[PDB]
Structure 1
Amino acid sequence: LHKNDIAINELMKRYCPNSVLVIIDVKPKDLGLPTEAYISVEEVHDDGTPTSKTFEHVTSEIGAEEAEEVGVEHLLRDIKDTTVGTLSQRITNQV
């Protein structure tokens, strides 16, 4: 994010009490779970500077409910599932 992304949230704060901006990534490369989440908050500082906004990082997770599971779970058609107990835990030990 460039430093100008703050005022966008400050403009739409009239729409929602707290607007969370989500950085995303169109091309997967690194390092892991894509995108990002930043919430608009005023933390001031321990140095007592005039209040400025440095967006705090919000942890992002990927999930689904029912139909959004149906689409992607059929769309994988790539790697074995899971398989539980053998390759799963050890590849996670690598990654």
Structure 2
Amino acid sequence: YVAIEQVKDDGTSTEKTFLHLPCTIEAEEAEEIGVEHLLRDVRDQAAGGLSIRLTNQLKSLKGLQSK
């Protein structure tokens, strides 16, 4: 979230607020080789084989419904 300053136009004064910015992960190369080496799990979703993405299909629906 980034603090922005903008007129909230409704008959209300200038409002200061925290607007969502999507964020992602990223790893430095130097860290990353070591991240991968630490990890060795079969994953909830890796985009691997048929059976793995199939699990993700069941998950993706239940995702949307709560959402």
Under a length normalisation based on structure 2, what TM-score does the superposition of the two structures give? 0.62
Aligned structure 1 segments of 4 or more residues deviating by more than 4 angstroms: none
**Aligned length in residues:** 57
Q: Which runs of 5+ in 2 are unaligned?
A: 60-67
Residue 13 of structure 1 is matched in structure 2 by none
Q: Structure 1, residues 56-85: CA drift from partner, whole Å, max 9, x if none?
A: 0010111223122112111112226x4624
Instruction: Name the one with the larger helix percent.
Output: 2
Residue 90 of structure 1 is matched in structure 2 by 54
**Percent identity among equivalent residues?**
49
Instruction: Name the one with the larger strand percent.
Output: 2
Q: Structure 1, residues 3-36: CA drift from partner, whole Å, max 9, x if none?
A: xxxxxxxxxxxxxxxxxxxxxxxxxxxxxxxxxx
Larger radius of gyration: 2
RMSD of aligned residue pairs (Cα, Å): 2.2
